[PDB]
Ligand binder design. Structure first.
Ligand SMILES: C#CCN(Cc1ccc2[nH]c(N)nc(=O)c2c1)c1ccc(C(=O)N[C@@H](CCC(=O)O)C(=O)O)cc1
Ligand SMILES: C#CCN(Cc1ccc2[nH]c(N)nc(=O)c2c1)c1ccc(C(=O)N[C@@H](CCC(=O)O)C(=O)O)cc1
Lengths: 264, 264
């Protein structure tokens, strides 16, 4: 999108060369922010074809509080394969923290449920937050959450959401996350009878991997196309009852997909 | 400061009227980010006199893991009085989460020391984070932490830090928070033998209380003066051994102070 392409160019122009845990190398900048007015259309990138299938099942997978990739396989999404253990477990990542954050005294907190109730009973709240950054359980995760802190905000019937992404793979992960959260916002707005507002993206260590230069240059020379339109076919009785079939994207005409190796 | 004044003018121009848990009412925007290059000078607002005494002692208090106001009283700092209970207790807030986040298995994580160790041995890590947003203990806190998530970053021998402030009182609280973290950055940098880089401030619900409007316009009519200089007269053995007297602020010639009420 114009904002996304602009960020890519910034990394290439101002990025600092860094050696990462994978040994591949990265171009990096620290601190950036983009805003997507959801009224203008769904923020699914068009300068490269994105697969909405894996994006939607992952989100539904999170909402169920599931951390085993079994469900993702049932739907042919393999984005989490290389971090799962021999049994397909990732540890207490996203899904677990969102649905049942463990307290030191044994109880459990369902942040999604509390968020739903805050939006309905106390929309003006300044602490409508979901955090996946559970310090005392990080060592148990097969990987540290790269998008671990987000906040909802309501003003004039509109529902907005800001996501702080501490670590960000610009080429592979970013397009995925923008679409994923814009999706959650639409879902939330529907369950709470609100209009969709803005999706604010805030980055920390925002990088571009060394073996992605070519693909980035290719994508940068393409012209962005009008954003698609998200359509929700039916309104389920809760935020936990959605299915892949309920979503329909419309008017999505992207440039051809771009293959790129993942840094493991 | 230029950036601060521009933020204020921004919430006044694009802000929406909202109500809050107190009943005062606020003018508010959602999503903002500004950067401070710490080598340009120490970011202490000059368009009104600020209280260094209070800012320094609060930070030293946090670093010790203290959550009782006794220490602050021994040094004539009353900024926390309204929220302390009969015994001076605030519950497990900033100081406790920073130095001793409780895990489910009975352990406690000292985030400050772990971050110091990461800055020395793994400065390229993208997980150099400190969080005060302990979902499992929110109900024991006198207040919900408003500046609960920050990240460190190293590049070209310079230490940077980004704070995500979910709820920000722009008139009263922002000047304090900006100076507080800028100070933490200097202390961190001195302990790791790094130079200071940027301080990036990102806000969620960024607001101005209704009864701060006249004071805001009064301040907006002033010309920011040159930024002061921070001089550290000693290099303590640890990040935990700093004293109020180790710090010297030079060239601080601010406009007169502007009094305003705190919305409890
Ligand atoms: C972010 C995120 C989600 N993820 C999983 C993922 C990977 C690393 C992480 N790292 C961290 N720290 N946190 C995470 O949550 C995390 C999640 C993704 C993984 C791969 C692709 C990917 O390979 N995309 C390719 C091919 C997609 C396909 O199979 O069709 C592409 O062309 O886009 C996208 C998203
Ligand atoms: C942020 C923060 C720290 N704090 C404490 C404080 C107060 C409310 C909070 N509210 C929330 N949600 N989170 C917090 O962490 C929090 C912290 C401050 C409190 C008062 C002043 C204040 O009244 N400043 C006035 C008077 C100063 C004085 O003379 O004593 C001024 O003129 O500046 C500044 C900082």
């Amino acid at each position: 999108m114009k904002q996304y392409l602009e960020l890519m160019q910034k990394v290439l122009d101002e990025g600092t060369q860094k050696n990462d845990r994978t040994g591949t190398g990265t171009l990096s900048i620290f601190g950036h922010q983009m805003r997507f007015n959801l009224q203008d259309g769904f923020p699914l990138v068009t300068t490269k074809r994105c697969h909405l299938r894996s994006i939607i099942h992952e989100l539904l997978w999170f909402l169920q509080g599931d951390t085993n990739i079994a469900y993702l396989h049932e739907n042919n999404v393999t984005i989490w394969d290389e971090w799962a253990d021999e049994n397909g477990d990732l540890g207490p990542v996203y899904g677990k923290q969102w649905r049942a954050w463990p307290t030191p005294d044994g109880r459990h907190i369902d942040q999604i449920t509390t968020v739903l109730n805050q939006l309905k009973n106390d929309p003006d709240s300044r602490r409508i937050i979901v955090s996946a950054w559970n310090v005392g359980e990080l060592d148990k995760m097969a990987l540290a959450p790269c998008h671990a802190f987000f906040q909802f905000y309501v003003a004039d019937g509109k529902l907005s959401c800001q996501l702080y992404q501490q670590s960000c793979d610009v080429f592979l992960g970013l397009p995925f996350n923008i679409a994923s959260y814009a999706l959650l916002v639409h879902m939330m707005a529907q369950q709470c009878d609100l209009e969709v507002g803005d999706f604010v993206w805030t980055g920390g260590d925002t990088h571009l991997y060394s073996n992605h230069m070519d693909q980035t240059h290719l994508q940068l020379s393409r012209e962005p196309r009008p954003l698609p339109k998200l359509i929700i076919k039916r309104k389920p009785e809760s935020i936990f009852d959605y299915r892949f079939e309920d979503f329909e994207i419309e008017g999505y005409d992207p440039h051809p997909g771009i293959k790129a190796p993942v840094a493991i």
